[PDB]
PDB file of C-alpha atoms and ligand atoms in Angstrom:
ATOM      1  CA  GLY A   1     -28.391 -77.499   4.855  1.00  0.00           C
ATOM      2  CA  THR A   2     -28.465 -76.925   1.346  1.00  0.00           C
ATOM      3  CA  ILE A   3     -30.515 -79.155  -1.097  1.00  0.00           C
ATOM      4  CA  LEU A   4     -31.344 -79.496  -4.549  1.00  0.00           C
ATOM      5  CA  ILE A   5     -35.078 -79.469  -6.209  1.00  0.00           C
ATOM      6  CA  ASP A   6     -34.746 -79.880  -9.429  1.00  0.00           C
ATOM      7  CA  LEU A   7     -36.771 -77.887 -11.929  1.00  0.00           C
ATOM      8  CA  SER A   8     -39.207 -79.131 -14.687  1.00  0.00           C
ATOM      9  CA  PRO A   9     -38.869 -78.402 -18.786  1.00  0.00           C
ATOM     10  CA  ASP A  10     -42.193 -77.502 -18.527  1.00  0.00           C
ATOM     11  CA  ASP A  11     -42.533 -75.294 -15.095  1.00  0.00           C
ATOM     12  CA  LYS A  12     -42.258 -71.283 -16.270  1.00  0.00           C
ATOM     13  CA  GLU A  13     -39.489 -71.027 -13.446  1.00  0.00           C
ATOM     14  CA  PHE A  14     -37.329 -72.636 -15.640  1.00  0.00           C
ATOM     15  CA  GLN A  15     -38.634 -71.674 -18.425  1.00  0.00           C
ATOM     16  CA  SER A  16     -38.113 -67.848 -17.094  1.00  0.00           C
ATOM     17  CA  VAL A  17     -34.307 -69.071 -16.211  1.00  0.00           C
ATOM     18  CA  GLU A  18     -33.603 -70.423 -19.156  1.00  0.00           C
ATOM     19  CA  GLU A  19     -34.200 -67.139 -21.063  1.00  0.00           C
ATOM     20  CA  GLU A  20     -31.714 -65.126 -19.149  1.00  0.00           C
ATOM     21  CA  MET A  21     -29.236 -67.614 -20.357  1.00  0.00           C
ATOM     22  CA  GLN A  22     -29.502 -67.900 -23.258  1.00  0.00           C
ATOM     23  CA  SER A  23     -30.796 -64.327 -24.738  1.00  0.00           C
ATOM     24  CA  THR A  24     -27.830 -63.217 -22.532  1.00  0.00           C
ATOM     25  CA  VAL A  25     -25.129 -64.529 -24.957  1.00  0.00           C
ATOM     26  CA  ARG A  26     -22.867 -62.174 -26.748  1.00  0.00           C
ATOM     27  CA  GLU A  27     -19.395 -62.140 -28.586  1.00  0.00           C
ATOM     28  CA  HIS A  28     -16.740 -61.480 -26.356  1.00  0.00           C
ATOM     29  CA  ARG A  29     -13.191 -59.715 -27.836  1.00  0.00           C
ATOM     30  CA  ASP A  30     -10.950 -63.021 -27.204  1.00  0.00           C
ATOM     31  CA  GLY A  31     -13.126 -64.598 -30.302  1.00  0.00           C
ATOM     32  CA  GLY A  32     -13.559 -66.961 -27.949  1.00  0.00           C
ATOM     33  CA  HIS A  33     -10.005 -67.943 -26.321  1.00  0.00           C
ATOM     34  CA  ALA A  34     -11.274 -68.408 -22.090  1.00  0.00           C
ATOM     35  CA  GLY A  35     -15.296 -69.753 -22.729  1.00  0.00           C
ATOM     36  CA  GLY A  36     -15.576 -70.828 -26.009  1.00  0.00           C
ATOM     37  CA  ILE A  37     -17.184 -70.301 -29.394  1.00  0.00           C
ATOM     38  CA  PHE A  38     -20.712 -70.192 -29.712  1.00  0.00           C
ATOM     39  CA  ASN A  39     -23.643 -68.670 -29.843  1.00  0.00           C
ATOM     40  CA  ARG A  40     -26.448 -70.338 -27.513  1.00  0.00           C
ATOM     41  CA  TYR A  41     -26.209 -73.532 -24.894  1.00  0.00           C
ATOM     42  CA  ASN A  42     -27.924 -76.461 -24.076  1.00  0.00           C
ATOM     43  CA  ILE A  43     -28.781 -76.498 -21.184  1.00  0.00           C
ATOM     44  CA  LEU A  44     -28.632 -79.767 -19.474  1.00  0.00           C
ATOM     45  CA  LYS A  45     -30.713 -79.123 -16.121  1.00  0.00           C
ATOM     46  CA  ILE A  46     -31.818 -76.219 -13.282  1.00  0.00           C
ATOM     47  CA  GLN A  47     -31.753 -76.809  -9.881  1.00  0.00           C
ATOM     48  CA  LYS A  48     -33.152 -73.765  -7.322  1.00  0.00           C
ATOM     49  CA  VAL A  49     -30.962 -73.876  -4.588  1.00  0.00           C
ATOM     50  CA  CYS A  50     -31.981 -73.947  -0.961  1.00  0.00           C
ATOM     51  CA  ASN A  51     -29.684 -73.016   2.175  1.00  0.00           C
ATOM     52  CA  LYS A  52     -32.217 -71.672   4.847  1.00  0.00           C
ATOM     53  CA  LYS A  53     -28.989 -70.512   6.963  1.00  0.00           C
ATOM     54  CA  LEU A  54     -27.733 -68.463   3.566  1.00  0.00           C
ATOM     55  CA  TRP A  55     -31.154 -67.082   3.172  1.00  0.00           C
ATOM     56  CA  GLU A  56     -31.498 -65.741   6.594  1.00  0.00           C
ATOM     57  CA  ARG A  57     -28.200 -64.761   6.121  1.00  0.00           C
ATOM     58  CA  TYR A  58     -29.186 -62.681   3.004  1.00  0.00           C
ATOM     59  CA  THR A  59     -32.415 -61.263   3.768  1.00  0.00           C
ATOM     60  CA  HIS A  60     -30.812 -60.098   7.470  1.00  0.00           C
ATOM     61  CA  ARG A  61     -28.118 -57.855   4.766  1.00  0.00           C
ATOM     62  CA  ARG A  62     -30.542 -56.842   2.194  1.00  0.00           C
ATOM     63  CA  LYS A  63     -32.359 -55.233   5.113  1.00  0.00           C
ATOM     64  CA  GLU A  64     -29.563 -53.449   6.429  1.00  0.00           C
ATOM     65  CA  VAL A  65     -28.679 -52.603   2.715  1.00  0.00           C
ATOM     66  CA  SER A  66     -32.455 -51.111   1.894  1.00  0.00           C
ATOM     67  CA  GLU A  67     -32.532 -48.964   5.269  1.00  0.00           C
ATOM     68  CA  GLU A  68     -29.393 -48.011   4.312  1.00  0.00           C
ATOM     69  CA  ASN A  69     -30.720 -47.321   1.007  1.00  0.00           C
ATOM     70  CA  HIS A  70     -33.889 -45.301   1.289  1.00  0.00           C
ATOM     71  CA  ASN A  71     -35.755 -48.025   1.804  1.00  0.00           C
ATOM     72  CA  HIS A  72     -34.409 -49.229  -1.177  1.00  0.00           C
ATOM     73  CA  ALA A  73     -32.120 -53.173  -1.831  1.00  0.00           C
ATOM     74  CA  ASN A  74     -31.706 -51.763  -5.602  1.00  0.00           C
ATOM     75  CA  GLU A  75     -31.785 -56.991  -5.911  1.00  0.00           C
ATOM     76  CA  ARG A  76     -30.121 -57.492  -9.173  1.00  0.00           C
ATOM     77  CA  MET A  77     -30.825 -61.601 -10.691  1.00  0.00           C
ATOM     78  CA  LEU A  78     -27.244 -61.930 -12.128  1.00  0.00           C
ATOM     79  CA  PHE A  79     -24.958 -64.943 -13.407  1.00  0.00           C
ATOM     80  CA  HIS A  80     -21.182 -66.094 -11.473  1.00  0.00           C
ATOM     81  CA  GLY A  81     -18.924 -68.198 -12.524  1.00  0.00           C
ATOM     82  CA  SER A  82     -16.476 -70.164 -11.361  1.00  0.00           C
ATOM     83  CA  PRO A  83     -14.234 -73.135  -9.945  1.00  0.00           C
ATOM     84  CA  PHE A  84     -16.018 -72.606  -6.950  1.00  0.00           C
ATOM     85  CA  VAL A  85     -19.301 -73.489  -7.494  1.00  0.00           C
ATOM     86  CA  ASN A  86     -19.993 -76.281  -5.374  1.00  0.00           C
ATOM     87  CA  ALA A  87     -18.409 -74.611  -2.399  1.00  0.00           C
ATOM     88  CA  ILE A  88     -21.026 -71.904  -3.436  1.00  0.00           C
ATOM     89  CA  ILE A  89     -24.431 -73.711  -3.142  1.00  0.00           C
ATOM     90  CA  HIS A  90     -23.445 -75.444   0.512  1.00  0.00           C
ATOM     91  CA  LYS A  91     -21.448 -72.402   1.997  1.00  0.00           C
ATOM     92  CA  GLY A  92     -22.586 -69.586   0.605  1.00  0.00           C
ATOM     93  CA  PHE A  93     -20.226 -66.529  -1.041  1.00  0.00           C
ATOM     94  CA  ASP A  94     -17.262 -65.152   1.149  1.00  0.00           C
ATOM     95  CA  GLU A  95     -13.734 -64.048   0.577  1.00  0.00           C
ATOM     96  CA  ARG A  96     -12.350 -66.995  -1.433  1.00  0.00           C
ATOM     97  CA  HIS A  97     -15.041 -66.658  -4.245  1.00  0.00           C
ATOM     98  CA  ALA A  98     -13.344 -62.626  -4.838  1.00  0.00           C
ATOM     99  CA  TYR A  99     -11.368 -61.966  -8.239  1.00  0.00           C
ATOM    100  CA  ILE A 100      -8.563 -59.890  -5.954  1.00  0.00           C
ATOM    101  CA  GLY A 101      -6.533 -59.132  -9.468  1.00  0.00           C
ATOM    102  CA  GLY A 102     -10.163 -57.325 -11.251  1.00  0.00           C
ATOM    103  CA  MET A 103     -10.938 -53.927 -12.812  1.00  0.00           C
ATOM    104  CA  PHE A 104     -12.725 -52.868 -10.249  1.00  0.00           C
ATOM    105  CA  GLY A 105     -10.792 -54.320  -7.284  1.00  0.00           C
ATOM    106  CA  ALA A 106     -11.146 -57.373  -4.959  1.00  0.00           C
ATOM    107  CA  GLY A 107     -14.284 -58.204  -4.012  1.00  0.00           C
ATOM    108  CA  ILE A 108     -16.561 -60.853  -5.477  1.00  0.00           C
ATOM    109  CA  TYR A 109     -17.800 -60.306 -10.086  1.00  0.00           C
ATOM    110  CA  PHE A 110     -21.070 -60.755 -11.388  1.00  0.00           C
ATOM    111  CA  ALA A 111     -22.561 -60.647 -15.277  1.00  0.00           C
ATOM    112  CA  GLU A 112     -25.347 -59.629 -16.572  1.00  0.00           C
ATOM    113  CA  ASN A 113     -24.096 -61.752 -20.291  1.00  0.00           C
ATOM    114  CA  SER A 114     -24.526 -64.796 -19.286  1.00  0.00           C
ATOM    115  CA  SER A 115     -21.205 -65.209 -21.830  1.00  0.00           C
ATOM    116  CA  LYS A 116     -19.010 -63.324 -19.938  1.00  0.00           C
ATOM    117  CA  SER A 117     -19.956 -65.464 -16.256  1.00  0.00           C
ATOM    118  CA  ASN A 118     -19.031 -68.586 -18.832  1.00  0.00           C
ATOM    119  CA  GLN A 119     -16.170 -67.315 -19.360  1.00  0.00           C
ATOM    120  CA  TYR A 120     -14.657 -68.112 -16.047  1.00  0.00           C
ATOM    121  CA  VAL A 121     -15.963 -71.416 -15.141  1.00  0.00           C
ATOM    122  CA  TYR A 122     -12.366 -72.900 -15.191  1.00  0.00           C
ATOM    123  CA  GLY A 123     -11.312 -70.295 -13.968  1.00  0.00           C
ATOM    124  CA  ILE A 124      -9.475 -66.239 -14.625  1.00  0.00           C
ATOM    125  CA  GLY A 125      -9.064 -66.617 -18.194  1.00  0.00           C
ATOM    126  CA  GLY A 126     -10.535 -69.982 -18.322  1.00  0.00           C
ATOM    127  CA  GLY A 127      -7.478 -71.539 -16.897  1.00  0.00           C
ATOM    128  CA  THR A 128      -6.481 -74.745 -18.636  1.00  0.00           C
ATOM    129  CA  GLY A 129      -9.424 -75.179 -19.803  1.00  0.00           C
ATOM    130  CA  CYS A 130     -12.064 -78.385 -18.580  1.00  0.00           C
ATOM    131  CA  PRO A 131     -10.126 -81.091 -16.139  1.00  0.00           C
ATOM    132  CA  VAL A 132     -10.959 -83.714 -18.556  1.00  0.00           C
ATOM    133  CA  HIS A 133      -9.996 -82.373 -22.303  1.00  0.00           C
ATOM    134  CA  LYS A 134      -8.089 -79.060 -21.252  1.00  0.00           C
ATOM    135  CA  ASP A 135      -9.950 -77.636 -24.044  1.00  0.00           C
ATOM    136  CA  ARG A 136     -11.466 -73.580 -22.865  1.00  0.00           C
ATOM    137  CA  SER A 137     -13.864 -74.094 -25.633  1.00  0.00           C
ATOM    138  CA  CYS A 138     -14.947 -77.742 -24.280  1.00  0.00           C
ATOM    139  CA  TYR A 139     -18.382 -79.018 -26.263  1.00  0.00           C
ATOM    140  CA  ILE A 140     -18.734 -82.706 -24.853  1.00  0.00           C
ATOM    141  CA  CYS A 141     -17.983 -81.755 -20.613  1.00  0.00           C
ATOM    142  CA  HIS A 142     -21.182 -80.379 -18.644  1.00  0.00           C
ATOM    143  CA  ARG A 143     -20.307 -76.811 -17.163  1.00  0.00           C
ATOM    144  CA  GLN A 144     -22.719 -75.025 -14.484  1.00  0.00           C
ATOM    145  CA  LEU A 145     -23.146 -71.183 -13.886  1.00  0.00           C
ATOM    146  CA  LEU A 146     -24.955 -69.818 -10.966  1.00  0.00           C
ATOM    147  CA  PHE A 147     -28.094 -67.043 -11.631  1.00  0.00           C
ATOM    148  CA  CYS A 148     -27.673 -65.267  -8.173  1.00  0.00           C
ATOM    149  CA  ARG A 149     -30.119 -63.052  -6.674  1.00  0.00           C
ATOM    150  CA  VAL A 150     -27.285 -59.536  -5.815  1.00  0.00           C
ATOM    151  CA  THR A 151     -28.284 -56.877  -3.129  1.00  0.00           C
ATOM    152  CA  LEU A 152     -26.690 -53.895  -5.040  1.00  0.00           C
ATOM    153  CA  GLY A 153     -27.630 -51.060  -2.864  1.00  0.00           C
ATOM    154  CA  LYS A 154     -26.309 -47.611  -4.138  1.00  0.00           C
ATOM    155  CA  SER A 155     -24.039 -48.444  -6.454  1.00  0.00           C
ATOM    156  CA  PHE A 156     -20.382 -46.501  -7.182  1.00  0.00           C
ATOM    157  CA  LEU A 157     -20.496 -45.829 -10.979  1.00  0.00           C
ATOM    158  CA  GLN A 158     -17.381 -46.620 -13.163  1.00  0.00           C
ATOM    159  CA  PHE A 159     -17.732 -45.867 -17.126  1.00  0.00           C
ATOM    160  CA  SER A 160     -14.745 -48.211 -18.532  1.00  0.00           C
ATOM    161  CA  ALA A 161     -13.793 -50.490 -21.496  1.00  0.00           C
ATOM    162  CA  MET A 162     -11.611 -58.488   0.342  1.00  0.00           C
ATOM    163  CA  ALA A 163     -11.329 -54.995   0.043  1.00  0.00           C
ATOM    164  CA  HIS A 164     -14.369 -52.414   0.823  1.00  0.00           C
ATOM    165  CA  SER A 165     -16.976 -51.219  -1.134  1.00  0.00           C
ATOM    166  CA  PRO A 166     -16.765 -47.074  -2.125  1.00  0.00           C
ATOM    167  CA  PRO A 167     -17.184 -44.820   0.901  1.00  0.00           C
ATOM    168  CA  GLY A 168     -21.112 -44.043   0.679  1.00  0.00           C
ATOM    169  CA  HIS A 169     -21.709 -47.055  -1.145  1.00  0.00           C
ATOM    170  CA  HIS A 170     -21.890 -51.249  -1.201  1.00  0.00           C
ATOM    171  CA  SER A 171     -21.399 -52.419  -5.122  1.00  0.00           C
ATOM    172  CA  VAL A 172     -19.126 -51.088  -7.889  1.00  0.00           C
ATOM    173  CA  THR A 173     -21.451 -50.605 -11.080  1.00  0.00           C
ATOM    174  CA  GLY A 174     -18.901 -51.467 -14.206  1.00  0.00           C
ATOM    175  CA  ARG A 175     -20.755 -49.694 -17.168  1.00  0.00           C
ATOM    176  CA  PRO A 176     -19.103 -51.013 -20.830  1.00  0.00           C
ATOM    177  CA  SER A 177     -18.216 -47.905 -22.215  1.00  0.00           C
ATOM    178  CA  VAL A 178     -16.493 -49.122 -26.246  1.00  0.00           C
ATOM    179  CA  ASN A 179     -17.815 -52.705 -26.719  1.00  0.00           C
ATOM    180  CA  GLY A 180     -21.950 -50.886 -26.715  1.00  0.00           C
ATOM    181  CA  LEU A 181     -22.757 -54.623 -27.154  1.00  0.00           C
ATOM    182  CA  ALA A 182     -21.774 -55.661 -23.499  1.00  0.00           C
ATOM    183  CA  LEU A 183     -23.891 -55.392 -20.530  1.00  0.00           C
ATOM    184  CA  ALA A 184     -23.150 -54.118 -17.439  1.00  0.00           C
ATOM    185  CA  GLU A 185     -20.688 -56.101 -14.822  1.00  0.00           C
ATOM    186  CA  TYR A 186     -21.448 -55.612 -10.612  1.00  0.00           C
ATOM    187  CA  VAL A 187     -19.209 -56.185  -8.011  1.00  0.00           C
ATOM    188  CA  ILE A 188     -19.889 -56.865  -4.496  1.00  0.00           C
ATOM    189  CA  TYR A 189     -17.324 -56.642  -0.946  1.00  0.00           C
ATOM    190  CA  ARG A 190     -19.325 -59.001   1.559  1.00  0.00           C
ATOM    191  CA  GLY A 191     -20.926 -62.742   0.485  1.00  0.00           C
ATOM    192  CA  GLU A 192     -23.623 -61.957   2.754  1.00  0.00           C
ATOM    193  CA  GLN A 193     -24.980 -59.539  -0.690  1.00  0.00           C
ATOM    194  CA  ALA A 194     -25.818 -62.377  -2.882  1.00  0.00           C
ATOM    195  CA  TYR A 195     -27.548 -65.925  -2.843  1.00  0.00           C
ATOM    196  CA  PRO A 196     -27.051 -68.532  -5.666  1.00  0.00           C
ATOM    197  CA  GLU A 197     -30.551 -69.060  -6.619  1.00  0.00           C
ATOM    198  CA  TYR A 198     -30.378 -71.098  -9.311  1.00  0.00           C
ATOM    199  CA  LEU A 199     -27.613 -73.892 -10.499  1.00  0.00           C
ATOM    200  CA  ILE A 200     -27.869 -74.367 -14.083  1.00  0.00           C
ATOM    201  CA  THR A 201     -25.748 -77.493 -15.765  1.00  0.00           C
ATOM    202  CA  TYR A 202     -25.566 -77.159 -19.081  1.00  0.00           C
ATOM    203  CA  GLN A 203     -22.995 -77.839 -21.997  1.00  0.00           C
ATOM    204  CA  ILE A 204     -22.017 -74.693 -25.101  1.00  0.00           C
ATOM    205  CA  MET A 205     -23.400 -75.053 -28.761  1.00  0.00           C
ATOM    206  CA  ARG A 206     -20.853 -75.703 -31.283  1.00  0.00           C
ATOM    207  CA  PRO A 207     -21.934 -73.293 -34.109  1.00  0.00           C
ATOM    208  CA  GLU A 208     -23.617 -74.606 -37.329  1.00  0.00           C
TER     209      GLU A 208
HETATM  210  C1  F37 B 301     -12.463 -67.114  -7.533  1.00  0.00           C
HETATM  211  C2  F37 B 301     -12.115 -66.955  -8.327  1.00  0.00           C
HETATM  212  C3  F37 B 301     -12.133 -66.334  -9.254  1.00  0.00           C
HETATM  213  C4  F37 B 301     -14.238 -66.722  -9.707  1.00  0.00           C
HETATM  214  C5  F37 B 301     -14.884 -66.049 -10.759  1.00  0.00           C
HETATM  215  C6  F37 B 301     -14.687 -64.883 -11.577  1.00  0.00           C
HETATM  216  C7  F37 B 301     -15.438 -64.034 -12.022  1.00  0.00           C
HETATM  217  N1  F37 B 301     -15.312 -63.573 -12.419  1.00  0.00           N
HETATM  218  C8  F37 B 301     -16.684 -62.153 -13.007  1.00  0.00           C
HETATM  219  C9  F37 B 301     -15.695 -61.014 -14.014  1.00  0.00           C
HETATM  220  C10 F37 B 301     -16.311 -60.366 -14.661  1.00  0.00           C
HETATM  221  C11 F37 B 301     -17.939 -60.924 -14.650  1.00  0.00           C
HETATM  222  C12 F37 B 301     -18.062 -61.979 -14.105  1.00  0.00           C
HETATM  223  C13 F37 B 301     -17.164 -62.942 -13.596  1.00  0.00           C
HETATM  224  C14 F37 B 301     -18.055 -63.806 -12.630  1.00  0.00           C
HETATM  225  O1  F37 B 301     -18.737 -64.709 -12.723  1.00  0.00           O
HETATM  226  N2  F37 B 301     -16.961 -64.739 -12.390  1.00  0.00           N
HETATM  227  C15 F37 B 301     -13.077 -64.626 -11.103  1.00  0.00           C
HETATM  228  C16 F37 B 301     -12.582 -65.152 -10.203  1.00  0.00           C
HETATM  229  N3  F37 B 301     -10.522 -65.855  -8.041  1.00  0.00           N
HETATM  230  C17 F37 B 301      -9.369 -66.528  -8.666  1.00  0.00           C
HETATM  231  O2  F37 B 301      -8.269 -65.908  -7.994  1.00  0.00           O
HETATM  232  N4  F37 B 301      -9.656 -67.922  -9.151  1.00  0.00           N
HETATM  233  C18 F37 B 301     -10.525 -67.750  -9.178  1.00  0.00           C
HETATM  234  O3  F37 B 301     -11.314 -69.033 -10.342  1.00  0.00           O
HETATM  235 ZN1   ZN B 302     -14.136 -81.299 -22.155  1.00  0.00          ZN
END
């Protein structure tokens, strides 16, 4: 049931998604090991992901969360990197998309920094890099991220350097507590609390 609609680069919606992608790049404490060395991306395509059933599954869960949290879904737009983006956009998020060993427990993880989600496009720690060159810093191969609508509801705040969310909460917020430049990361424990709204195809760019 999924169809993908291409956005034109002249569309303000393409432009606002591209800007969130580019402006949330940061340096990583691994010096680029997982995700590659880059300061910006070459955006190749942005497609809107349209699936009525997945959308309705999302909004149904959003209303439940909202009603458990003084009518506040606490909805964000966040990045997700995964080897399974193609399954996600067709079938939705479920437990096979979870990071069992994540620092905040077995759930599905999202980032404010696009460059953080980039480190997972080829797997945990960037795996063995791109399929074609086995290069975690490949500048040639096309990568994809999702820019997702995520319901956080009442989020458990963890300060720091599938399971259940903590009792009385709908998600966990991993607040960065050492690296002053890192943005927050978030975990949900129900696939129905995220909708994969944009599929972004891109290359990382070699710095000049
Ligand atoms: C499905 C998978 C997976 C997928 C995505 C991520 C992921 N982890 C994150 C952790 C922090 C912030 C963003 C992300 C993010 O965008 N993606 C971690 C593990 N779990 C797994 O064991 N291997 C995987 O590739
Ligand atoms: Zn490659």
